[PDB]
Design a protein around this ligand. Structure first.
Ligand code: HEM
Ligand code: HEM
Ligand SMILES: Cc1cc(N)nc(CCc2cncc(CCc3cc(C)nc(N)c3)c2)c1
Ligand SMILES: Cc1cc(N)nc(CCc2cncc(CCc3cc(C)nc(N)c3)c2)c1
Ligand SMILES: Cc1cc(N)nc(CCc2cncc(CCc3cc(C)nc(N)c3)c2)c1
Ligand SMILES: Cc1cc(N)nc(CCc2cncc(CCc3cc(C)nc(N)c3)c2)c1
Ligand SMILES: [Cl-]
Ligand SMILES: [Cl-]
Ligand SMILES: [Zn+2]
Ligand SMILES: [Zn+2]
Ligand SMILES: [Zn+2]
Lengths: 407, 411
């Protein structure tokens, strides 16, 4: 099966062969495409381990070698005996990097081979998880010169002793339902904030309160910890032309760090594996600030701009959107905190995708997520056909643990 | 079976049952999604089930399923197919079929309008000259001096595939493109190939930036013939900006009538290879796609230069700034000239209302997110956070290859 993808701006056609290695299911069928849906034993374990070890040994040009066969032998014996196995440090690093490489929704993958991997498999307690996470935050932040990193806690055993970070991101702001009926802070985080308060957090009750970590070790009830304030780098948002923009009192945090996903390597499952990169500007300026269910700031900004807001066709929303995104980029750049604009990021991804087709035979990509949430068609990803499929090692969505945990 | 879709802004959940009536394939499998791939003579045997499926649908819509009239029509069509290898649609069935092809068009954000479609029956047409007259009449009716009305003109169906009616133009009104010896393009680069064909067939090209192409029309499988649409029937809008007085001197204009002429209409297994249809523009189609695609008029740089934007780094978002102003100009210009146009906020809000109504009254609304989301400011429109299900219902509009690749030249 050779599949062709065309770029409609450049007429360039690429051939994908890598999809033939796809394992997991898409949710689509021959009858119905679900491309726009957000969430569409010993016996099982050895084939998964073999598939992975085969790809690993092939990557280091040692496929079919004595070391290859011996390692397969070693792992087989370990699974038969213990019902599981442990990855070598080399295998863990390779697996984490490839999980990023394989992430079809990530526009930033040109960077995939430069990931710092922190092995936290020796961690046993929630206090130990906190120390590791602070160290990740400080390393990744690096005084504004951000470095990609992942911290990997112990793998799932019987499923009754899971390590989990309850937070969706390591750094994120609290949300509070008001007597007024509105929401103060980030509406995305109202439920998690409540759980935090319920578990004893003393909430400051402001618009940008950094949430504490709720950390679960070894299947135990989660415990609360506050990240040292001085490790959380934040940027106040101002505009290069509009003096009034600072008066909106907006800020954001510098470090985007996903903490709710599951890392699968060689059939093993790492349910706590926080990872971090740096922001694309639209993530803050379009998603976090302008989604109606988020900080929802479009109307306030347009008002300060004195735009004609009576008619949609004046494009007042589009004008204010652009200015908000200009201010996000300017503020991060002025404070020397790494950020990438959507033009630069998508150009890089296209270059990455071409590299991947030539050296790997393809690059799985989800167009719905790869195309930026503003100015889509003026970026080089819009007219690029993409094929979406699932390769392992992988990062997988997992449900919020409070729906699952038994106290 | 039931499939659920969620809206991630409102948490509204809807349930699709209509997908059960989908027949044709998507291109996707359990292992690979082809959601962003742009392109992912029947026998008696296959034709009668297709005819019956259609007629059952039609008679249900008029609340006459199982009636004598329904049963009599099935028998009549069966006997026509067995005897002549095909059948003719009644005028009522043709109208219903064309409206439903539009209703079913998963890439169309304008479908709130689907039941308001003027159908011109051109199945008595026999010559290219005849096609030309029908097409002029469509253009005049649809244009309505700027108060645009949706319309479709339907030419005779496929017989043996050797006698097809085709409009060779991709759109009824579109501008010429000319490749220069230095490798630059004058006019619309999308139409260079078709323009060369027109010139070869005898068109005297003005060689300007906005030359309306001639129609190239094929009747009954014959070689196509050239006709010029009368200039007085082609409504155009000069583009200016409400605040920037220099915008007019960019010399931009566009035509008012968007009219697709290269698609195939399938109704009850019958294939209408020439079926031009038209509505009115969403502003971004002109201001984003036609003006700003790098492979089209590609005006972003010139506009940004005139705005004196900082163009040294992409992070100043100069491209984004220029794009908004161009799109303001397009909407302003059409509105000022009283030519129907819809902005992307209005169009997507109306589509979501249409979609929710369809889920309630019909059990679903197939939709292609990739095409439905506008090409600028996506996430601030109500379609961006709407989950959609894409599947194929008939009657339908289908892509067909450009006829110059397939035509047997007679001489
Ligand atoms: C280095 C800079 C990085 C940039 C600029 C970047 C960019 C992005 C963006 C813009 C998104 C989608 C957000 C949206 O559409 O609103 C995303 C998603 C994602 N990225 Fe990256 N990324 C980076 C690093 C990383 C790293 C280090 C990893 C893992 C090691 C990673 C894995 C993922 C995954 C798994 C998703 C999908 C997340 C989900 O399903 O919620 N990315 N990336
Ligand atoms: C009445 C106003 C209408 C509006 C505002 C509208 C809007 C649009 C837009 C914006 C697109 C996609 C263009 C793009 O993504 O650049 C589209 C596609 C399409 N529409 Fe409509 N539409 C209208 C009427 C019609 C009518 C009358 C029909 C047929 C009877 C129709 C059938 C289609 C089809 C088949 C496509 C996909 C075209 C292709 O594959 O090339 N629409 N519509
Ligand atoms: C490492 C990294 C770097 C970066 N620049 N951006 C990201 C995106 C993080 C991100 C932020 N906000 C929202 C999401 C989506 C969360 C999300 C929600 C649901 C329901 N399903 C999913 N698969 C995912 C992801 C990650
Ligand atoms: C369709 C789409 C496109 C794109 N470029 N990025 C994304 C992912 C990021 C994203 C943006 N806006 C909104 C969301 C949903 C956030 C969200 C997450 C959860 C758990 N519950 C909710 N009700 C809502 C995610 C999605
Ligand atoms: C009736 C109608 C009204 C309206 N406002 N817009 C449209 C969209 C017309 C349109 C304009 N430019 C480009 C296209 C895409 C052409 C196209 C190209 C390819 C390769 N495959 C396809 N299925 C389609 C469509 C149609
Ligand atoms: C991905 C996508 C999104 C969207 N919203 N609309 C469309 C359809 C309209 C559209 C816009 N720009 C470009 C094209 C392709 C036009 C095109 C057509 C042909 C035949 N050859 C080419 N090289 C290019 C179509 C496509
Ligand atoms: Cl968004
Ligand atoms: Cl476009
Ligand atoms: Zn959003
Ligand atoms: Zn699909
Ligand atoms: Zn385009």
């Amino acid at each position: 099966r050779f599949l062709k993808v065309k770029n409609w701006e450049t007429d360039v056609v690429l051939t994908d062969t890598l999809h033939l290695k796809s394992t997991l299911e898409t949710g689509c069928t021959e009858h119905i495409c679900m491309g726009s849906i957000m969430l569409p034993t010993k016996d099982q374990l050895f084939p998964l381990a073999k598939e992975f070890l085969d790809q690993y040994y092939s990557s280091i040009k040692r496929f079919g070698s004595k070391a290859h066969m011996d390692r397969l032998e070693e792992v087989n014996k370990e699974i038969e005996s213990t019902s599981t196995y442990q990855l070598k440090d080399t295998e863990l690093i390779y697996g984490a990097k490839h999980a990023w490489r394989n992430a079809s929704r990530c526009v930033g993958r040109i960077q995939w081979s430069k990931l710092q991997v922190f092995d936290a498999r020796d961690c046993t307690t929630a206090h130990g998880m906190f120390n590791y996470i602070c160290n990740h935050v400080k390393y990744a932040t690096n005084k504004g010169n951000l470095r990609s990193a992942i911290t990997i806690f112990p793998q799932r055993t019987d499923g009754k002793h899971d390590f989990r970070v309850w937070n969706s991101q390591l750094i994120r702001y609290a949300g509070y339902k008001q007597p007024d009926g509105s929401t103060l802070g980030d509406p995305a985080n109202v439920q998690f904030t409540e759980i935090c308060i319920q578990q004893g957090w003393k909430a400051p009750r402001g618009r940008f309160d950094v949430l504490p970590l709720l950390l679960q070790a070894n299947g135990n009830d989660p415990e609360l910890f506050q990240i040292p304030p001085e490790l959380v780098l934040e940027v106040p948002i101002r505009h290069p032309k509009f003096d009034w923009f600072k008066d909106l009192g907006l800020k954001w945090y510098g470090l985007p760090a996903v903490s709710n996903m599951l890392l699968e390597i060689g059939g093993l499952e790492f349910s706590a594996c926080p990872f971090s990169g740096w922001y694309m500007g639209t993530e803050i300026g379009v998603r976090d600030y302008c989604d109606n269910s988020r900080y929802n700031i479009l109307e306030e900004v347009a008002k300060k701009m004195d735009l004609d807001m009576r008619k949609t066709s004046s494009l007042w929303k589009d004008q204010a959107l652009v200015e908000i995104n200009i201010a996000v980029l300017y503020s991060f750049q002025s404070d020397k905190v790494t950020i990438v604009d959507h033009h630069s990021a998508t150009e890089s991804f296209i270059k990455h995708m071409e590299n991947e087709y030539r050296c790997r035979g393809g690059c799985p990509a989800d167009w719905v997520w790869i195309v930026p949430p503003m100015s889509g068609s003026i970026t080089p990803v819009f007219h690029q056909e993409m094929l979406n499929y699932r390769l392992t090692p992988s990062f997988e969505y997992q449900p919020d643990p409070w729906n699952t945990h038994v106290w």
